[PDB]
RNA sequence: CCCGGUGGAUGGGCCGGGGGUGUAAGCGCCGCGAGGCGUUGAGCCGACCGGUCCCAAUCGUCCGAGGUCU
RNA sequence: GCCCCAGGCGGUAGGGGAGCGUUCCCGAUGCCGAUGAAGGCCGACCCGCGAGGGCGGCUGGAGGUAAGGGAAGUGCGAAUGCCGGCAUGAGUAACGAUAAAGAGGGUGAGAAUCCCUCUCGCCGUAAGCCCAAGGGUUCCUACGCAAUGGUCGUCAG
RNA sequence: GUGGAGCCUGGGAGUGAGGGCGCGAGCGAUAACGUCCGCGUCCGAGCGCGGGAACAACCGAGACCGCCAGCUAAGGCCCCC
RNA sequence: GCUGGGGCUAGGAGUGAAAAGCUAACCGAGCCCGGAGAUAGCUGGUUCUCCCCGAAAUGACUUUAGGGUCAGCCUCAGGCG
RNA sequence: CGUGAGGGAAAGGUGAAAAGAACCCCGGGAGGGGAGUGAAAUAGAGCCUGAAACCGUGGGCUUACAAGCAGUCACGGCCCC
RNA sequence: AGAUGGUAAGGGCCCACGGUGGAUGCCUCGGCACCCGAGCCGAUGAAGGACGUGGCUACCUGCGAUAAGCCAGGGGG
């Protein structure tokens, strides 16, 4: 290992080409059927607190 | 009518926020609210603030409806660095750039 | 490891003290530089 | 190549897993529901459907059993007395898992519930 | 990539088989005792092979056709 | 005789000639300037062969300075140049011992990180206790979390 | 023979590592994109231009500028062209 | 033997069971300041425009051979023609 | 910073006047939007002007069979005046 | 049979607008140089300092336990 290093200086439309990819996915939610709010799906609604229609957790 | 708010100098890397308010742009004002509450990222944070603090902005000072809200344009200027020190191997010393960021929302009334 | 500066309070004062410097030639001389270019500190201060 | 290999090695070593399913256990069984790591919580399905069917077996020898895990006597107790009778018709399922939608924010880990089952 | 998504056996349980270890504990008896014998191929049992909806894949959301011209 | 005639016009080192621009002196107790100087940004407009100069638009808000001369710290891309910024690598490596953590409760806007309880692991010729040197208020308490703490941090040396 | 010819007198130089090609020689091995000389040229400084595919010195030819004009040089006239 | 504290030996000097080691993290001669803006026939750099002309890389001599003095070749001014 | 002798920084500018932004709203605060002072507030204290590098945000053209010291000439297309 | 423009994950150029930054312009409680004046202080304790002193005082200035000071004279109003 003798130390690589960047030959030279990225330009800068090469650094947002590979920045491309780097978009974040907007996360998905699913009204509530409980409460109508969004939320992640397959997961609690803090809002109502309810799953499955029928409460799990004490919101 | 556009309102505005803007987060200056928050402790925060730029680029890293920009990855989530470019997540919001364009979107209606409840889009925006749902998709920060539930986004994985420390920026999504100071983004919620601003956005909030924008339609605050928008119904009491500007006097907007509420309702026709969305993100007109957003976006994250960078604001002055801290350098701090890294001490790093063999008495050599690094600085580390501290990133503080500037946010600006930008709130119209959608229309149809 | 160890290294060059272990401090001593003891050391430092008969070693670089006000009293050290004026009780030689050379170390008048540098009281007077010291004294020239207005050093606050005309010796390396050191507690007791 | 994890090829058919069941179980999660979980960032620890392996007493560290064991005393992670033992505490995890303990408190699951000293409040019925506890927060935690999804990874955690499916890795603790079985290792709490386990002890508690032996709580459905409910004989001594079970109960060196468990005890060997659990390594209390009260909360043994406990579960061979109010947790034994009240899963004594169920058959497997003594747990449930739920997904909490709210990451934690220290460091963004997602988190779910484990509660023994009504 | 593949599979499943209540119509589900996809995974965890549980059950049954496999397989491994090798006669659990407790008890009884025999021993001064260490121990031994019977209960007992017992008990435990990761992946393996199937069954069982016990627990979980809830409810869901959004994209995505109006077909270029000689 | 300002124009025509003939000829010439690749160019380093280098020699010579001719101009442009910057700071400052005279012009100047002058002139321009709040109707907007300098300066900044812009022009596809005009002058010149060019160095550059006008002129225009917006910013700027208070100096600028002619013709014609003089005097220079006078013209920058390079000097592994100097100072200062901002980049690249890069959201990468790393986050500083593999002694190990988990759960409940509370606090609090905000909790993996703070406080409490319980459970677990580690040291235990110490990773425990005392003194000395050195350190110099870091000690206690209350408050606070801009920064610092390699994350957070409602905690804190 | 009037030429960016010549001479003289002064000021200022840089240069004093050259190279290739041709020819005449030495050395070399009648080897070297070799070395060393003489004559000459080009490059250097003409890596401006056409050709030689590409290529400093091989062939043509000395780039003041512009033109959406014409004639030729070497070299080409089957396509690229 | 190791170690604490108290002190001493220093720069062509000390010390050194001796390696040319160590002497405040680079010791075949410490560091700081000063001489000092040492010297550097060596390396790098040397900043606006236009125009005219336009080299050399040779000889001689050289403690000289990558540097120099003279001459060669450039330019400029004047004179001669 | 250096044991020390000693080396040695950076760092000026609101406004005429603090008139330095009451108060409301969002926010834990910060910060922000109003309001207000102000000739002016992209003069708001991180304050005269505020360049470039750099960074993003919108718009116009353009780009996923494509060869490149990034230019230059022509032609065409699109957009604007 | 055919031809074809088309999409932009992003990127490029240009324009507009921002942020960062602090060049530039202007200014100057500062400094440089030259000339003039002046030119020693200290055991009556100097230069230079430590530490203290304010009602509340971090620091600089002042001063010295009489401690941002005391006395007399002069200036001043
Ligand atoms: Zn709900």
């Known amino acids: 290992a003798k130390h690589p290093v960047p030959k030279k200086k990225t330009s800068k439309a090469r650094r947002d080409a590979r920045r491309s990819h780097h978009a974040l996915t907007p996360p998905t939610l699913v009204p509530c059927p409980e409460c109508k709010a969004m939320k992640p799906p397959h997961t609690v609604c803090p809002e109502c607190g309810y799953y499955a229609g029928r409460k799990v957790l004490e919101v | ?112 | 490891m160890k290294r060059t500066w272990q401090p001593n309070r003891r050391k430092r004062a008969k070693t670089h003290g006000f009293r050290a410097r004026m009780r030689t030639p050379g170390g008048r001389k540098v009281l007077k530089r010291r004294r020239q270019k207005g050093r606050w500190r005309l010796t390396p201060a050191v507690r007791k | 190549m994890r090829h058919l290999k069941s179980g999660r090695k979980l960032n620890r070593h392996s007493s560290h897993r064991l005393a992670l399913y033992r505490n995890q256990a303990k408190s699951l069984l000293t409040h019925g529901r506890i927060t935690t790591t999804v990874p955690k919580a499916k890795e603790l399905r079985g290792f709490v459907d386990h002890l508690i069917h032996l709580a459905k077996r409910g004989d001594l020898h079970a109960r060196r059993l468990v005890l060997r895990d659990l390594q209390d006597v009260k909360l043994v107790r406990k579960l061979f007395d109010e947790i034994a009778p009240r899963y004594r018709d169920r058959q497997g399922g003594y747990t449930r898992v739920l997904k909490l939608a709210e990451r934690r924010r220290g460091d963004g880990a997602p988190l779910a519930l484990v509660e023994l089952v009504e």
């Open chain 2, 1 to 112: 009518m556009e309102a505005k708010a803007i987060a200056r100098y928050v402790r925060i890397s730029p680029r890293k926020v920009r990855l989530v308010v470019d997540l919001i742009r364009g979107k209606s004002l409840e889009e925006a609210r749902n998709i920060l509450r539930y986004t994985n990222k420390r920026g999504a944070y100071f983004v919620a603030k601003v956005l909030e603090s924008a339609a605050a902005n928008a119904v009491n000072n500007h006097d907007m409806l509420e309702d026709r809200l969305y993100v007109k344009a957003a976006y994250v200027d960078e604001g002055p660095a801290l350098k701090r020190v890294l001490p790093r191997a063999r008495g050599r010393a690094d600085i580390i750039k501290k990133r503080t960021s500037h946010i600006t929302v930008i709130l119209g009334e959608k229309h149809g």
